[PDB]
Design a protein around this nucleic acid. Sequence first.
DNA 1: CAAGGCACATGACAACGGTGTTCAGTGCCGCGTTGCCCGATACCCCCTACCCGTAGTTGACTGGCATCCGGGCGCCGGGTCGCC
Length: 89
Amino acid sequence: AEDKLANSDKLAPKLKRELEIIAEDGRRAKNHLLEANLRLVVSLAKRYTGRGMLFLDLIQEGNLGLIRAVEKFDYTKGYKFSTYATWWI
DNA sequence: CAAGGCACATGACAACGGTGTTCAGTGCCGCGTTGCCCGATACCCCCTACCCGTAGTTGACTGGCATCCGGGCGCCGGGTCGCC
């Protein structure tokens, strides 16, 4: 939807708003996924705590890795998101 | 006995002696004042070796940490909920 909106060719206004709405719903689902995986990322932050970096800082950096991973994740892989994410985390 | 005539020496007279200056010229023989000559030195090039940053890696793997009491001591000062 956002790809089609990004193109310069003219689209109908109602169709453009529908595409924007679908992209917004995708954004909402993205944040749903991130909040779901917050627990995994804090677990992996535990896994590297106590090495001179504050635990919440490690959590935040892992969260950066998490947003990267979701930005690079899709169902085309026949695996759960948990297995794929942990590498990027 | 006085006056006039000859010896030696004498007031100056220059010119040599010997030696000290003079402006004069030209060198004599030590410092320099500069053209080379090289020699080294900064400064472009090419090559590759290695430091450092970026980007993947798919069974599954979904909430942690150990705190903290034997100050001690008092006050300020505010909050905080009972009180009637």
